[PDB]
Design a protein around this ligand. Sequence first.
Ligand code: CL
Lengths: 99, 98, 55, 53, 81, 83
Amino acid sequence: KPHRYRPGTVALREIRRYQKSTELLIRKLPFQRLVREIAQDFKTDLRFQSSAVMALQEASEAYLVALFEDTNLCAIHAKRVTIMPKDIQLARRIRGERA
Amino acid sequence: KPHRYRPGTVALREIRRYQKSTELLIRKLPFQRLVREIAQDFKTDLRFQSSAVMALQEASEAYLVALFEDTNLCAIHAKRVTIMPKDIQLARRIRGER
Amino acid sequence: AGNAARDNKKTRIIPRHLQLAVRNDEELNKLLGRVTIAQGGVLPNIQSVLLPKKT
Amino acid sequence: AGNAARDNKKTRIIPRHLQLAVRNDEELNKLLGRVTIAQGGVLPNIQSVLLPK
Amino acid sequence: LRDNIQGITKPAIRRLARRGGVKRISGLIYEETRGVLKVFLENVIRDAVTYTEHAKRKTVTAMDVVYALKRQGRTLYGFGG
Amino acid sequence: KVLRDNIQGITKPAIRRLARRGGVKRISGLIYEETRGVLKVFLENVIRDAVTYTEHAKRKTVTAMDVVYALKRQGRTLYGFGG
DNA sequence: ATCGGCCGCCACAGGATGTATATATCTGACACGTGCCTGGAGACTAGGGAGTAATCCCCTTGGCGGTTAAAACGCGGGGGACAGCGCGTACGTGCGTTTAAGCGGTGCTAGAGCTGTCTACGACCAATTGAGCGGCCTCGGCACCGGGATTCTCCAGGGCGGCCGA
DNA sequence: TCGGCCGCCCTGGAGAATCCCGGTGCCGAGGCCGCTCAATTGGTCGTAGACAGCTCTAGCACCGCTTAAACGCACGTACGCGCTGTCCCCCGCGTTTTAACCGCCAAGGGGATTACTCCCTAGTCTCCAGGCACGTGTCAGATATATACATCCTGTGGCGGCCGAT
Ligand SMILES: [Cl-]
């Protein structure tokens, strides 16, 4: 009587749902707290425009989505469908960001 | 029968020998002919300084060596020691030149 | 972008429509490959091996 | 580069010595990551899985 | 003031990976992704705060983050320019 | 004479030497054709930009400075020939 | 029944090979002197870009109420990751063959490169004015709640061999 | 000879999700108006660059030896790749918590703007000395030839497992 789907179908459904949407996936306030925490180690008592934190979030989510794109290509290349930190490290290494 | 090595030992020996050397590995004259051939489709009767073709060769070999480095990392990542056009395409795709 | 707005049955160009307009064209993708467009997301791209074998 | 010339037992800095001087330092590698030095080659780097057991 | 990297939640990294097209996510992804995101934010906020220092200001404008991302070769549209 | 078939001048042992400098142990057979393709497209972009710099300099000889400016413009700065 | 042959595996070492290291030659490329001249330096003035004070209000941060979408946690399973093994194929090694890269010569000339003339094209200055921007408004395109069609997902059953094994 | 369970193929119907279609509100984009300041026009010099000519550098062209290295062929074995067995870890889903979001308000930090001064650099002129082209020495090192030392593939001896034989 209780209905349950296979894993692949809800996974692909979420892939479609979030590749159609445009909204920011990281929540606004914990990202803002992360930004203030990282900023704290450069100068005390820093202030931020709201559009500055929104710009940080737009670029950060776009960067991680391109990163997961390359990570998925690394996984698929290695005959897997599950991404691994191996795949993230390979992606960042080929992109030249390992520093 | 005479002495014969394993593949891995002469392979690693050449890896060591060419990572120590600095000379240009592509020959000068066929690369020059390739440069004139590619240039031909942009303007007829183009001339080239010798240092220009040497600069092209230095940059082309450095680019292909960085390409084979990323390609070897793609091969190793796929639990293989053999580079493949799969690996070259993955490298160029992640680097963003596709 | 007006074309992608028409395809989306809208008469107001949104960021998503600029995103689709640039990234579905090859030469605009070559122009803005290292450029992030805000509120745009990515293209609806799903790889073939991740799809279930509907054969 | 003089250090890498000393290590190579040489008193004349060649391109290879500049190559080693930049690419063996981390922050000079960060500075010149997208920069090709001519007549330099690459570092003698051999991966661990390619070596015979 | 240390669990702010844990504010990047496991559902949020999962949503990001779904937008990236990822079907399956191992458990060791999430800490690695928090790390990589933290390093990216370190570089960006470092440059933006440098730009704020040069302007002798106390607030970080959106133009500063645009200039920083533009310097780092990741141009961001829609925040001035 | 119109130059043709010069991409085969990038021989198989030269690609193997380039692979050795990159640290490659074992090389499959389609690597050589793929590598000739990638090097062809790279030289297409670089020689295209250098020819363009020659065009605007009102000249017909591609200098080393043109190739340096071109490689530098594409984010691959070449040292040794000026800049 | 235990024991030698043989395979697996380990390992110990003649032997061929590549290569780290010792001298000799000869070079030609790096280091240094010399002329000189053109760019570096010193001095002086103008002014306009920049330093500094005050103001004010924009907007950035801090605080609280609720609520609810979202995050955290558990749990059962199933499907993909991972290890192992066998087949084969196709790549590397070695040797002979041979194609042509490289070096060394000269001859020629198109064209890079430097010099003089001038002229036409752009900076600089004032007036003016109309196009572009701040402010406002209204309204319709977009966002959103609800309902029905639909559209793919998935599991249950019916028939179907089929496979034995008790 | 037997039917009891067990994986396969097909098909059907619940079932959650999604597309489509209206209905209503809402708030930001389109449009109108002032105005103000920079776009435009006219005119003036100054010099950057277009153009002619001369030169002289090296770039292309050809040829002759010269071996360096590419091409081809056999071969063998090591890794690519397919198959399979396991297992464990992640994914869907229900339940519970929780803090993100909205929204509302309050106080003040400083962003920005204007005014005024002020002093730092742009620009000229004159002087002079350090940097560059050119010439000449001189020694660092690439390489040939010499031993000659690690090193690795393999030849083979030895220990143990085991496996069958008389
Ligand atoms: Cl991992």
